[PDB]
Amino acid sequence: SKAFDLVVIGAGSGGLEAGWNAATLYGKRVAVVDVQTSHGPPFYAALGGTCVNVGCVPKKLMVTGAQYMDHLRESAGFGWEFDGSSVKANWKKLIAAKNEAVLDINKSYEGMFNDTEGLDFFLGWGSLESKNVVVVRETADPKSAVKERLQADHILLATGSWPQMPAIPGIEHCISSNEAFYLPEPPRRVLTVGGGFISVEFAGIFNAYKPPGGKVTLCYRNNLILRGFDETIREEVTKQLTANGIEIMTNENPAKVSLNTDGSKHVTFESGKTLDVDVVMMAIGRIPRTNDLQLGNVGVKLTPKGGVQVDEFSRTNVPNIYAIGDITDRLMLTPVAINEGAALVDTVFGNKPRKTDHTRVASAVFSIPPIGTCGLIEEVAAKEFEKVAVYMSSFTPLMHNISGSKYKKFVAKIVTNHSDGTVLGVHLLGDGAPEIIQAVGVCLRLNAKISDFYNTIGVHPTSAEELCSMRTPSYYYVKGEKMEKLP
Amino acid sequence: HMSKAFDLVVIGAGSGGLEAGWNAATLYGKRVAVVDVQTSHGPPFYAALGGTCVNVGCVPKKLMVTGAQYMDHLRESAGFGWEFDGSSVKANWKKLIAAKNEAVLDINKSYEGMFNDTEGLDFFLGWGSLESKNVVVVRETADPKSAVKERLQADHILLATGSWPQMPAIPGIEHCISSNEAFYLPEPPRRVLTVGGGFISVEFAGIFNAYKPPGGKVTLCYRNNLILRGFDETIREEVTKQLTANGIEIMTNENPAKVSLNTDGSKHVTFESGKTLDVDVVMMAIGRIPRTNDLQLGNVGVKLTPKGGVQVDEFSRTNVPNIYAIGDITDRLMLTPVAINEGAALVDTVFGNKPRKTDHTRVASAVFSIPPIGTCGLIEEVAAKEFEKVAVYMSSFTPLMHNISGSKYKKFVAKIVTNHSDGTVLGVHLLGDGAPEIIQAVGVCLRLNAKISDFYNTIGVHPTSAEELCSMRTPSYYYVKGEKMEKLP
Numbered sequence: 001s002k003a004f005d006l007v008v009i010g011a012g013s014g015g016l017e018a019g020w021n022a023a024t025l026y027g028k029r030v031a032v033v034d035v036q037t038s039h040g041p042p043f044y045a046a047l048g049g050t051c052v053n054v055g056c057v058p059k060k061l062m063v064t065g066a067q068y069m070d071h072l073r074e075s076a077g078f079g080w081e082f083d084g085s086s087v088k089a090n091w092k093k094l095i096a097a098k099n100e101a102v103l104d105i106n107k108s109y110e111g112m113f114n115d116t117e118g119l120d121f122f123l124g125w126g127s128l129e130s131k132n133v134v135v136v137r138e139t140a141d142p143k144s145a146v147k148e149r150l151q152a153d154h155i156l157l158a159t160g161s162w163p164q165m166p167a168i169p170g171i172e173h174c175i176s177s178n179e180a181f182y183l184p185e186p187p188r189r190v191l192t193v194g195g196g197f198i199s200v201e202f203a204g205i206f207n208a209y210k211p212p213g214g215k216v217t218l219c220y221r222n223n224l225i226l227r228g229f230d231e232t233i234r235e236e237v238t239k240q241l242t243a244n245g246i247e248i249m250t251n252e253n254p255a256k257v258s259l260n261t262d263g264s265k266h267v268t269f270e271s272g273k274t275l276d277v278d279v280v281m282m283a284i285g286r287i288p289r290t291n292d293l294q295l296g297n298v299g300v301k302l303t304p305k306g307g308v309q310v311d312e313f314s315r316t317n318v319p320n321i322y323a324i325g326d327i328t329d330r331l332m333l334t335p336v337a338i339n340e341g342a343a344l345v346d347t348v349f350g351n352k353p354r355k356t357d358h359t360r361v362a363s364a365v366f367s368i369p370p371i372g373t374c375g376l377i378e379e380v381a382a383k384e385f386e387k388v389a390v391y392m393s394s395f396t397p398l399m400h401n402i403s404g405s406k407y408k409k410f411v412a413k414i415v416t417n418h419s420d421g422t423v424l425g426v427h428l429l430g431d432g433a434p435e436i437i438q439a440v441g442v443c444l445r446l447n448a449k450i451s452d453f454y455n456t457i458g459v460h461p462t463s464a465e466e467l468c469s470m471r472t473p474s475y476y477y478v479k480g481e482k483m484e485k486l487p
Numbered sequence: 488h489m490s491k492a493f494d495l496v497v498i499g500a501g502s503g504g505l506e507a508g509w510n511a512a513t514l515y516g517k518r519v520a521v522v523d524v525q526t527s528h529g530p531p532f533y534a535a536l537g538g539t540c541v542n543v544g545c546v547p548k549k550l551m552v553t554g555a556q557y558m559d560h561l562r563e564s565a566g567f568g569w570e571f572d573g574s575s576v577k578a579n580w581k582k583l584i585a586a587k588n589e590a591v592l593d594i595n596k597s598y599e600g601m602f603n604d605t606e607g608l609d610f611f612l613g614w615g616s617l618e619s620k621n622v623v624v625v626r627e628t629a630d631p632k633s634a635v636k637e638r639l640q641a642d643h644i645l646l647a648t649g650s651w652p653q654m655p656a657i658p659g660i661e662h663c664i665s666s667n668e669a670f671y672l673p674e675p676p677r678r679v680l681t682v683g684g685g686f687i688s689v690e691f692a693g694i695f696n697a698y699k700p701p702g703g704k705v706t707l708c709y710r711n712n713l714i715l716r717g718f719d720e721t722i723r724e725e726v727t728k729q730l731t732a733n734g735i736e737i738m739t740n741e742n743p744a745k746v747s748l749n750t751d752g753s754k755h756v757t758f759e760s761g762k763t764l765d766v767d768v769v770m771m772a773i774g775r776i777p778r779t780n781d782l783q784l785g786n787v788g789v790k791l792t793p794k795g796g797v798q799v800d801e802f803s804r805t806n807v808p809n810i811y812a813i814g815d816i817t818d819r820l821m822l823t824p825v826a827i828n829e830g831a832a833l834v835d836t837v838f839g840n841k842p843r844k845t846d847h848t849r850v851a852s853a854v855f856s857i858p859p860i861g862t863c864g865l866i867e868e869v870a871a872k873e874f875e876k877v878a879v880y881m882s883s884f885t886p887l888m889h890n891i892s893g894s895k896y897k898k899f900v901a902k903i904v905t906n907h908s909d910g911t912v913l914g915v916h917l918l919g920d921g922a923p924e925i926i927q928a929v930g931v932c933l934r935l936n937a938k939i940s941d942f943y944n945t946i947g948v949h950p951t952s953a954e955e956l957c958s959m960r961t962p963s964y965y966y967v968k969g970e971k972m973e974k975l976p
């Protein structure tokens with residue numbers, strides 16, 4: 001048995017921020033538990049978390065790789081010549097480079113633990129034995145061999161989320177993003193199921209690395225992908241994915257999957273349509289990872305949707321037990337989990353309570369081309385405010401008239417409270433959008449108005465200067481109803 | 488044939504002059520004439536309708552830097568698994584130049600159509616000069632003895648003629664070119680010397696480095712010790728290293744003394760030190776000077792500064808009440824968006840009874856070097872002279888993607904400079920892919936008097952380079968009454 005100020009279950013984005021801050025900033029005794037010391041099968045996530053191992057970090061490297069399909073074609077308009085028939089995309093090389101980068105990160109976290117006073121790592125599966133006891137077992141089975149018993153003044157639940165798999169016949173013949181990161185070969189025909197960012201990002205990755213004759217299809221059960229993003233941008237990215245050879249099947253949903261004699265999969269949709277593919281990747285959602293924690297031993301309350309219930313300071317209903325990150329089933333982003341972890345420790349072990357602000361969080365989609373966004377979309381703003389103005393700019397940049405990718409319209413939209421000019425949301429589609437949006441997140445914390453943007457001098461030539469060139473609304477929402485002019 | 492009369496006559500149909508003229512005619516109903524010397528880009532006069540940025544400046548050079556970036560993309564693609572016949576790769580400069588020419592000409596034509604269409608906004612072709620306080624003469628050439636095409640009566644006159652490359656008076660200067668000619672070279676030079684340490688020399692060095700034929704070499708020389716004076720010093724040193732790493736030779740503390748022709752017609756450069764260099768093109772990029780000579784300002788007594796620009800007050804007014812000047816002719820910040828801002832502010836003040844002056848502080852700007860620079864506000868050594876305590880927050884590392892691409896020399900640098908007494912951000916300085924796009928919204932932040940805590944409190948977008956700006960909480964070092972030190976005393 002061992003005694004600690006804080007025990008953290010999950011060595012992920014939020015859990016490591018909390019543990020490192022508690023130990024080094026406040027001199028507390030910290031233990032952190034995770035199920036694997038490095039990335040990949042069998043548990044996929046590991047020391048460092050989902051983002052490091054099977055999330056933001058590797059997917060961004062793979063999207064960067066897929067972008068070269070466009071760069072090689074687009075170079076020709078600027079005078080670059082080479083033998084186009086010799087081009088091939090080596091997926092095995094991509095995966096190996098990615099594996100080496102992730103493993104390097106795994107190892108550096110290992111040395112962080114070895115080098116930091118009061119910060120200890122334990123390998124295994126953590127669960128709640130009692131209000132102040134965390135048990136670590138050999139496997140997820142609550143009857144496997146006990147490896148450690150950790151006495152804890154404070155306990156932090158930070159186990160993340162896991163892919164949601166629908167209850168359809170043949171679901172066992174589908175994969176999730178976890179397995180996609182380790183496919184031995186790039187699939188020639190693949191169906192990505194879902195309208196969210198993971199489905200869209202992997203569609204672009206597979207589209208660039210598919211062997212000759214390949215085809216990527218994305219299906220989504222409703223009418224328009226990327227629910228929760230700006231509607232203009234949802235429509236445009238649909239158009240631009242289609243322009244690069246991806247087939248978008250909206251209003252379609254798999255009803256069953258069966259095995260073909262050649263090893264491929266036969267998908268039947270609810271509509272009766274059918275599609276044969278080599279890989280079916282389900283990306284329909286991620287759900288809080290609560291089942292192995294034995295929350296019933298202590299009575300931690302869950303919400304109806306399955307998250308651990310928390311107040312604004314990450315406190316559960318059980319004193320001294322906290323939860324942060326995807327397990328709270330709110331904003332599933334790595335920088336939000338980190339922010340929550342730091343606020344938690346500042347509150348518990350320092351003399352200044354802090355709560356994370358979940359509004360005006362900038363985020364991105366690394367689609368090809370990508371999205372950057374911060375704040376409210378117009379239809380959400382129109383329910384909170386009597387008068388909303390939308391400023392819009394949408395055009396193909398000069399360089400893509402030369403590159404030949406004339407479909408690559410850049411979209412920039414600013415949403416305001418028209419009563420006082422306050423910027424409520426900014427939404428971008430196009431090369432650079434994730435980088436452009438970061439400092440917009442800072443602007444929204446300075447009560448920036450549309451006139452603050454338009455009165456700033458532009459940097460020229462950039463896509464970003466469009467944000468400082470919009471003076472006149474394109475249209476409005478009054479009492480919730482869209483209209484081109486004010487009454 | 489009779490003279491024509493206007494509320495406003497603009498000499499120079501460039502970045503500032505077109506903003507002023509369009510706004511005066513379309514926002515305030517005034518009658519406007521605009522004068523320029525050429526209706527589309529290129530020789531003989533290079534700049535033309537649209538101005539220096541459109542014709543031989545920001546717009547074409549950015550297209551050409553984008554073309555040059557593909558040399559890096561093609562090489563870097565192999566780390567991510569892309570395979571192709573490297574021996575087959577060729578950079579066709581003629582196709583680049585033709586694509587750029589068609590793009591610029593399309594802009595020329597659209598501006599020509601704006602004038603043909605817009606009530607109260609007229610274009611006159613020729614050389615404008617001041618005859619009297621209310622008369623602009625348009626002549627066939629810059630020579631004031633050349634024939635008169637029009638006389639334009641004007642209640643208000645706007646001088647917006649821009650600037651021009653400076654050429655040093657050395658023997659053999661006739662064998663050298665400027666950026667104007669660089670935009671029209673029939674073939675890419677095998678060996679080229681770019682002379683100068685400023686952004687134009689650096690940007691063109693990158694362009695020539697990508698399009699040079701097999702076995703070529705780009706050399707950049709600068710007469711002082713470190714290129715890119717005025718930019719963050721960490722970034723000055725890093726850009727130097729990363730240009731060197733891509734095969735550009737940087738000769739600092741060197742300056743051409745004379746140029747002669749070898750018997751084969753190549754240029755033989757002798758430096759002041761006695762070193763020699765043989766090249767096919769010498770491009771001078773040592774500075775740009777305001778274009779005042781042809782305006783005949785003595786006719787009306789408009790005062791120039793010692794430096795040579797038109798003297799103006801904060802509202803762009805010369806010493807002659809109804810004559811104004813904006814843009815590069817004022818020899819201050821030579822940027823297109825500053826000239827545009829000055830022109831809009833002038834017209835709002837004169838014709839819109841809503842007075843406004845341009846803020847020349849905290850202006851965001853970029854260098855499209857490879858990799859590029861984005862900056863806004865004060866460099867730390869300047870801040871240390873004005874503030875008792877200055878803090879510097881700094882992050883510099885090779886991003887993960889360039890550990891796979893192989894370009895491990897591509898360190899991304901992010902620096903924030905503050906007044907440590909109250910946290911106010913005084914300047915932000917960036918080096919790396921995306922930096923010009925990242926810095927734009929930073930300019931809005933500084934206009935809003937952002938403090939370092941406003942940056943740190945903002946949640947990052949992950950994974951990006953930009954999120955480094957929102958994860959810096961502890962100074963790397965300080966300046967205390969001018970003195971650099973790791974810790975406060």
Ligand SMILES: Cc1cc2nc3c(=O)[nH]c(=O)nc-3n(C[C@H](O)[C@H](O)[C@H](O)COP(=O)(O)OP(=O)(O)OC[C@H]3O[C@@H](n4cnc5c(N)ncnc54)[C@H](O)[C@@H]3O)c2cc1C
Binds near residue numbers: 010
């Ligand atoms: C494909 C993909 C792409 C993404 N891309 C982005 C992106 O670009 N940007 C972004 O901001 N977010 C992205 N995310 C989301 C991001 O990964 C999560 O928001 C973040 O990782 C959650 O942090 P966390 O601290 O809640 O948990 P995690 O980082 O998930 O860590 C939880 C850890 O708990 C461990 N664990 C689980 N159960 C137990 C147990 N019983 N005992 C011990 N250890 C346990 C797990 O092994 C894991 O390491 C992406 C996610 C995915 C799946």
Ligand SMILES: Cc1cc2nc3c(=O)[nH]c(=O)nc-3n(C[C@H](O)[C@H](O)[C@H](O)COP(=O)(O)OP(=O)(O)OC[C@H]3O[C@@H](n4cnc5c(N)ncnc54)[C@H](O)[C@@H]3O)c2cc1C
Binds near residue numbers: 499823824
């Ligand atoms: C190579 C290069 C790259 C650049 N890159 C950038 C960049 O990336 N970003 C940026 O912000 N700035 C850049 N600049 C600077 C930018 O081009 C200038 O700051 C801007 O064009 C100045 O605008 P203006 O209105 O002062 O004059 P201009 O735009 O220069 O317009 C002046 C016009 O006056 C005309 N003219 C001159 N004399 C007469 C006369 N007597 N009668 C009639 N017409 C006349 C000229 O033909 C010209 O069209 C660059 C400049 C160069 C040279």
Ligand SMILES: CC(=O)N1C[C@H]2CC[C@@H]1c1ccccc12
Binds near residue numbers: 668
């Ligand atoms: C003024 C300018 O930019 N020039 C560039 C080059 C060609 C024309 C002119 C010039 C004069 C003297 C020597 C070399 C040159």
Ligand SMILES: [Br-]
Binds near residue numbers: 219220221222253
């Ligand atoms: Br779906």
Ligand SMILES: [Br-]
Binds near residue numbers: 223227
């Ligand atoms: Br929908």
Ligand SMILES: [Br-]
Binds near residue numbers: 578579580581582674
């Ligand atoms: Br060529």
Ligand SMILES: [Br-]
Binds near residue numbers: 939943
């Ligand atoms: Br702070």
